[PDB]
Structures are given as structure tokens and as C-alpha cells.
Amino acid sequence: DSLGNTVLHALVMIADNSPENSALVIHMYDGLLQMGARLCPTVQLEEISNHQGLTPLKLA
Amino acid sequence: AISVLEMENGYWWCRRKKHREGRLLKVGTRWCFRVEEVNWAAW
């Protein structure tokens, strides 16, 4: 995006520490991570950083 | 709330004029007040 966030960063951003919200975020994150292993598996989706250098783990 | 309702009247030597909030139609055959909110209430 303009801020540098990828699909995985947005799922961290939209979380708000809620029961249903956390379950939805976790399910979607796991599904996207699994689907990333079938399409272009030569790259890692959990290493792309924003314009601030943060990764999804650090951003969380 | 009490302080707001008291100040809105104005000073005793100069009384002000009050104003409403929002404006809509009758919504079918009604000065409303918009309130946004965010909720993941099971869609």
C-alpha cells in the first residue's frame, strides 16, 4: 500500500482484541500463510517490511 | 453536563442564542443526530 503494509499487516491492524475478531484474524492469517506456500513458494511472506521497517510479528 | 447547560444560557448582561444539532427529513410519511460506531457483531 502507500504505507507499505501488505495483506498480512492489514490483518494485524484490523485486530482489536475481541473474541470473534481474534478468531477471524487468526483463521484468515493461517489460511493466507498456507496458500502462500502453493503460489510462488520461493519467497517468505513474513519478512516484508513497511516504510518503518517493521514486520507483522514486530508490528503486532 | 450541568456546567454546559449553565454556560449555554450566557451572562446576565448578554443573553445568547442557542442552536440545534443535525437536520434530516421525516424519513417516510425530525431533527436527527448522526452517531457512527464500529462493531464486529457477527456482521
From TrEMBL, chain B:
Q: Where is the signal peptide?
A: none
User: Out of the domains of life, which is the source?
Assistant: Eukaryota
Q: In its UniProt entry, what is this protein called? A: Transient receptor potential cation channel, subfamily V, member 2
Protein localization: Cell membrane
Q: Which start and end residues of the full protein are shown?
A: 665 to 715 of 761
Protein's gene: Trpv2
